Ligand binder design. Sequence first.
Ligand SMILES: CCCCCCCC(=O)SCCNC(=O)CCNC(=O)[C@H](O)C(C)(C)COP(=O)(O)OP(=O)(O)OC[C@H]1O[C@@H](n2cnc3c(N)ncnc32)[C@H](O)[C@@H]1OP(=O)(O)O
Ligand SMILES: CCCCCCCC(=O)SCCNC(=O)CCNC(=O)[C@H](O)C(C)(C)COP(=O)(O)OP(=O)(O)OC[C@H]1O[C@@H](n2cnc3c(N)ncnc32)[C@H](O)[C@@H]1OP(=O)(O)O
Ligand SMILES: NC(=O)c1ccc[n+]([C@@H]2O[C@H](COP(=O)([O-])OP(=O)(O)OC[C@H]3O[C@@H](n4cnc5c(N)ncnc54)[C@H](OP(=O)(O)O)[C@@H]3O)[C@@H](O)[C@H]2O)c1
Ligand SMILES: NC(=O)c1ccc[n+]([C@@H]2O[C@H](COP(=O)([O-])OP(=O)(O)OC[C@H]3O[C@@H](n4cnc5c(N)ncnc54)[C@H](OP(=O)(O)O)[C@@H]3O)[C@@H](O)[C@H]2O)c1
Lengths: 678, 678, 60
Amino acid sequence: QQLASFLSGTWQSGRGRSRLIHHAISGEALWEVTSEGLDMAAARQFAIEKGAPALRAMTFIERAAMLKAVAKHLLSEKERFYALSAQTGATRADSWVDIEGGIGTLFTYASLGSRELPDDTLWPEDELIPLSKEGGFAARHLLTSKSGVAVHINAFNFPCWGMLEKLAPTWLGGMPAIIKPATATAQLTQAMVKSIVDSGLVPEGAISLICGSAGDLLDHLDSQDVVTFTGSAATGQMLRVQPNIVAKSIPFTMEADSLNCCVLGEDVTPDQPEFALFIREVVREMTTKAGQKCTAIRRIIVPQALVNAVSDALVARLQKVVVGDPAQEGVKMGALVNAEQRADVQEKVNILLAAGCEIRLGGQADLSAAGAFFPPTLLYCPQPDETPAVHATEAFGPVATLMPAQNQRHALQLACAGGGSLAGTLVTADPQIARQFIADAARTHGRIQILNEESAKESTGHGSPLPQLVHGGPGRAGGGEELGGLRAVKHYMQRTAVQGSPTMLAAISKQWVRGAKVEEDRIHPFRKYFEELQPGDSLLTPRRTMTEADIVNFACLSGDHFYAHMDKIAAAESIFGERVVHGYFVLSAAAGLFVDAGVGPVIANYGLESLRFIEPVKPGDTIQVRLTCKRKTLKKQRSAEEKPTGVVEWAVEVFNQHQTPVALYSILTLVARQHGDF
Amino acid sequence: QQLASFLSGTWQSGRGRSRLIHHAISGEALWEVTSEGLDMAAARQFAIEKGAPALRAMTFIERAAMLKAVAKHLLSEKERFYALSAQTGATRADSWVDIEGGIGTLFTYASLGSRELPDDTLWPEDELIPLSKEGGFAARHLLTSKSGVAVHINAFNFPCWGMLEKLAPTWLGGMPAIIKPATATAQLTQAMVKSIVDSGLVPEGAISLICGSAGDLLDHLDSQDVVTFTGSAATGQMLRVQPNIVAKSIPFTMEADSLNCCVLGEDVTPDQPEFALFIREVVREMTTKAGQKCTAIRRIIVPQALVNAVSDALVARLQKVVVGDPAQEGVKMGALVNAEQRADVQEKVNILLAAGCEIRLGGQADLSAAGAFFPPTLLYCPQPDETPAVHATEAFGPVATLMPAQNQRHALQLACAGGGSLAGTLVTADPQIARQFIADAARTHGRIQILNEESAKESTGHGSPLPQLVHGGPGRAGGGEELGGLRAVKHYMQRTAVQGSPTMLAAISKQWVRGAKVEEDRIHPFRKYFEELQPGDSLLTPRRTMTEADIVNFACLSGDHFYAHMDKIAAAESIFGERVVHGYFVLSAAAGLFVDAGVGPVIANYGLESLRFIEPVKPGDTIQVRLTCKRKTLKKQRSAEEKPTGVVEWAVEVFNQHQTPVALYSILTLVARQHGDF
Amino acid sequence: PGDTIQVRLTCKRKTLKKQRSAEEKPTGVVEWAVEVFNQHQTPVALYSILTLVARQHGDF
Ligand SMILES: CCCCCCCC(=O)SCCNC(=O)CCNC(=O)[C@H](O)C(C)(C)COP(=O)(O)OP(=O)(O)OC[C@H]1O[C@@H](n2cnc3c(N)ncnc32)[C@H](O)[C@@H]1OP(=O)(O)O
Ligand SMILES: CCCCCCCC(=O)SCCNC(=O)CCNC(=O)[C@H](O)C(C)(C)COP(=O)(O)OP(=O)(O)OC[C@H]1O[C@@H](n2cnc3c(N)ncnc32)[C@H](O)[C@@H]1OP(=O)(O)O
Ligand SMILES: NC(=O)c1ccc[n+]([C@@H]2O[C@H](COP(=O)([O-])OP(=O)(O)OC[C@H]3O[C@@H](n4cnc5c(N)ncnc54)[C@H](OP(=O)(O)O)[C@@H]3O)[C@@H](O)[C@H]2O)c1
Ligand SMILES: NC(=O)c1ccc[n+]([C@@H]2O[C@H](COP(=O)([O-])OP(=O)(O)OC[C@H]3O[C@@H](n4cnc5c(N)ncnc54)[C@H](OP(=O)(O)O)[C@@H]3O)[C@@H](O)[C@H]2O)c1
């Protein structure tokens, strides 16, 4: 049966030598992959000259709305995805983690791109960097989306999660993608790609698919491309030194296999709940998805006095784990995906047994079975720092070694001896042990979960890479990082420091910055609606003279009787020399000066961005405010009952009779729109 | 004469086939460099086990103060640096740019690390990521340092600057550096390293130096090491495929040569000042350092109707450039650094002449002189979109080619055809031309100066990489990024998402988080000095019932007569349903509830970090405030008269009778210290 | 006007009450000697307030 790729807009298929997708729980070939004869240069050509300008013409708000639309359309027809994912030997809960994590990543990136990304093609990430003494020359950083493809090379472990966690920052970062899924489970990836394409939600060319070997794709990539690898280290170290990738100097974000530690602290004793949640976390992490996730615990570091207790509790917790078919009831652990993967797990076990020990059923794995089953394996290493094979070999299944420690100094070194890892866990209750663990072990781990009794209730676990936490570790784990919230959309963009005058930076950024020209047009910026506000709409307010009665009435009304305002003696002994006006009274009299009293488009106050008081305001000191529109960034009207609205940021610049800027800041404001969508 | 490398604390010297340093302006050999026989493994060993823990034991504020101390020590003896930099053929202005830019980078990183880096070994860059509904499981991103070394492989152009803008983020990130300067100019680099080491300011093992080849250094680096390269794109692409760098997966930040566009716009006519400053900018940028900087203009894109005018202006201005000895008077351009560099520039000119044209005195360069003199060269390309040798060959001297464009749609293509560049420049006055230029040409340039009449008065120039702007572009420019402000110190750190309870993240981060435990200790936190404030020192204030009279008195006193506060009718038809309390009055009644009236350590108010309003406060609705300490981050007492003080940040959590958090925010506050540093 | 006011609240006399009902809270009536003064430290307006102050332990 042919597994169809998606290149150059049309569903195509390969012609030549092939690999095939074995079923996991039974063992027959119900798909087969091929990509020979497919033109890769034409697919990259179609992506770059069709779907790249279709994404780059959108704003970030429209791209986040597109991600939310695809997320809802994929959450709707999710039931075929579980049937396609049960072919991988995964259980219902494991496939639930896979599918709903890969769709909740899309919802999370849609929410983040809706909230913190502008209604613009370009995203300015800095405020302003004043490079001149006067103010006529300045700079700010711009993130523009690249003009090429994003070659994503995935692993076989999460066809839904691991493909859609690379695809939401790619699309939110304005680039089209070409997904190369692993050929052991590409049927669920094609189900996802087909469900995306057959919806009309993404433009044509914004997504592709190569079921099978790429081969000629990496030899054709322009310098505006990115390649994001996910797999073993041995493959990505062959693809990093690919000559076009080093020649055109394209970003190659490799992220690879890892030996994830789980260190038990010295303060934990077996008569505590910490010990029970430690054993529960290690067993659940080692049995979730049959140990076929990158963030599975593979090195257990316990104190020396607790080795026999942990090794007797883990086995008694693990003998209740039922290994079998998922559709028959009472089964907790599923199967692996291949007999090739089963043979790989058992040969990595036999490598670990050359200098290790044995606690459970390890190398006794029935290779003559009609199903990729491997028994849940707990190992032992009595000499942990003498054997480098424990700290360099990951048996990619239900296997996790165990090894002692010596009083939270050998434990840190055994946690860091993995050569850079992807996840880790310290189970303690003393908050000063976790300080020492982060101060030495976070150099090598990309993510650390300090698990205690308060955390263990609503934790997501050791093996849940959140879409707003950095997934990626140094060294053996790959070095490259993913999923860092909006850090993940910045790999798909080019960071440029634009220099010039502020009136030029304001038109480049489509904002108002600090020293741009203003557009004062005889009526009030709070009277304009959202669509007729422009960044630059200033307001030179009338003045208000600060006096001693102002200080007295505000200190009475607010209750703020600080000595620099209400004492005549101590204000002379202070840094100010005499009594000064309250900073919050400057902040309140400013809003007395610019706020329209009348009913208009301005709805709420919504917060205040960044306040700084620069010079003190005294009695006998006029105050004049420059209310200037800065950003617009409309919202999405989450219900049809809701009024259409957008959150306009105004840049407030108070000053005094000498025109020096006392107390400049920036207010947000929820402003009504004339037109909506619902 | 031996030029001594500095390894393992001892000024050693190599034993082998030695390269020699020619004098630039006269031609003799007055140094010779070698590094054969030097144990590089012992150098990395001494660095990691001596200077890495000594740097990592400092706080970031101590490392910023160390950078300021080394900057003031290097500023006090700059005259020997000018004497050593005159040997590189540079003039007094060129050497001034080099030395004082290298030291101003140190002062800039001292200011940034003192203002925005914590008083801690670690650094949390996020606020908080709440990952649970109850709030007992959250995460935040920590930036711990790296426990290895930073290998810096520099070019010959900026021996002071190009070393000392890598040494400052490396030291501010707590790693020891092993600088490999280019052999053609390493005498000034050893002058800098000797001035640093013979001062007692830095720890021992915090800096090394290899005058000569590294040889056996890249084969010894562990995964906690980073390599930062600066040179041509032929060398760094061979250093990227080095087997230990790809095996241990260490960060190789390559940053290479670039063809730098300088686009003249259609709106600029030769009567304007824009044309004169365009010609002045191209001439000054091509004659500074004899065109031996990476950010020098090497492609001039002009409109088609203005080619003869630009060419006649450049010929009439560049013939006034006098090439000669820097010490004698009336000499503008200095020389190159080697006869080998002169031969390389001329053999690149012959490549550009194999498919180009000629305007001025180009390839007629004397290869038999006692000096590395090259005449200022202006070329011409009548078919710019047909000759790929113009967009792929850089002649690294005073050479810059010129080529026509067709009405701001060919100019953008000729700017983007450089294969990924660094330091572009548009010279216009129309702001929408600059908007269309950044919307297309910021994909290939890492920095773009939009130069107009307002910019050119206090512009830093085309070839001045600011220490707080991202230096480095994609493609041919390397893909690496340097000098990004605090973006550069994050190449030398490991970003780790630390999960766990907020009461655990508080102890890890040495801050307070959102739901951490509190230390209520019966006296007021505004009575405590800076040294006895702990992050977590809380205060549950008494209440205050918001009434209609409060709304009336605050709307009268401020002047904010907004309709949701002063109108019974319009507030009933608003989003609030009835009249609500001012948000600024909630902000002021909060400070009425937590501020100590008496004279104490609290000095000023200093600003307010991040305010958000969440639920509206109504009449008949009490208000209770939870002031709690969050960050400490002491200042450094810039004078002997100023008081020792620090800037404590307090997280403020106002709430109402239903305990829902109306208006949670964060105030800064300047708090006096009990003990100073002097 | 232009005259700082600093107040010295010191406890003067305690004289507990007897909690006339078992439902009543136990309380005593503390007298405080309030001594206001100015920047020249001369006593403008010294007085003496009574105050009903709750007791920790009662009898009923
Ligand atoms: C209610 C909270 C409890 C406290 C009790 C109440 C205390 C008070 O009410 S005091 C009265 C109101 N407060 C004031 O007027 C404070 C005045 N602000 C001051 O700058 C004061 O002179 C004082 C004492 C803080 C000295 O500041 P100083 O050490 O010289 O630093 P300074 O150079 O002024 O810069 C301060 C900040 O302004 C920022 N700033 C922003 N724009 C500018 C600008 N154009 N120019 C200067 N600074 C600027 C700076 O970046 C700096 O912030 P950062 O932390 O990021 O570096
Ligand atoms: C001076 C300016 C001009 C004059 C205007 C005068 C208007 C007024 O004075 S009104 C009186 C004071 N103002 C207010 O009370 C503002 C109104 N209060 C509100 O928050 C409103 O319910 C409203 C409509 C803005 C909320 O909008 P909503 O669609 O529900 O978004 P929502 O996400 O729930 O809350 C808004 C923000 O609170 C933030 N927030 C922070 N912590 C929390 C939390 N624990 N729970 C909920 N939200 C939180 C959210 O993150 C969001 O901020 P952001 O967009 O940056 O992420
Ligand atoms: N983010 C992470 O850190 C992360 C996440 C999930 C999994 N992983 C790691 O991934 C590993 C499991 O996946 P895996 O066994 O599939 O890794 P793999 O065998 O090394 O292959 C990974 C991917 O690379 C492709 N590939 C293989 N050889 C290639 C070549 N010569 N040229 C181009 N592409 C090639 C494969 O396609 P084919 O199908 O054609 O072989 C597959 O899609 C585990 O070790 C796990 O730790 C890491
Ligand atoms: N930020 C930037 O992008 C930037 C900044 C400044 C300059 N540059 C570029 O640098 C170039 C000029 O400098 P350059 O001629 O000195 O570059 P380079 O000669 O190619 O190499 C620079 C450094 O690399 C070392 N090196 C050379 N070959 C090596 C090898 N096989 N193995 C290990 N190390 C090796 C050199 O040492 P040796 O002295 O022994 O050769 C020198 O220290 C220009 O093209 C300019 O554009 C770029």
